[PDB]
Amino acid sequence: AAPYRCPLCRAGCPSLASMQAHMRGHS
Ligand SMILES: [Zn+2]
């Protein structure tokens, strides 16, 4: 699958710093 495919929200991004920034909102 894509490098960082986060299902919790449904989205994939090749950058970790970007997905990590969203993890701070994953309440
Ligand atoms: Zn997510």
Curated annotation (Swiss-Prot):
A zinc finger (C2H2-type) spans 4-26. It is found in: Nucleus. Disulfide bonds: none annotated. Isoform 1 is testis-specific and is not expressed in lymphoid organs such as thymus or spleen. Isoform 2 is expressed in both B- and T-lymphoid cells. Homodimer (via PTB domain). Interacts with the N-terminal of FANCC. Interacts with ZBTB16. Interacts with GATA3. Belongs to the krueppel C2H2-type zinc-finger protein family. The C-terminal zinc finger domain functions as a transcriptional transactivator. The BTB (POZ) domain possesses repressor activity. DNA-binding protein that binds to the to a 5'-TGTACAGTGT-3' core sequence. May function as a transcriptional transactivator and transcriptional repressor. Probably exerts its repressor effect by preventing GATA3 from binding to DNA. May play a role in regulating the differentiation and activation of helper T-cells. This is Zinc finger and BTB domain-containing protein 32. It comes from Mus musculus (Mouse). The lineage of its organism: Eukaryota, Metazoa, Chordata, Craniata, Vertebrata.
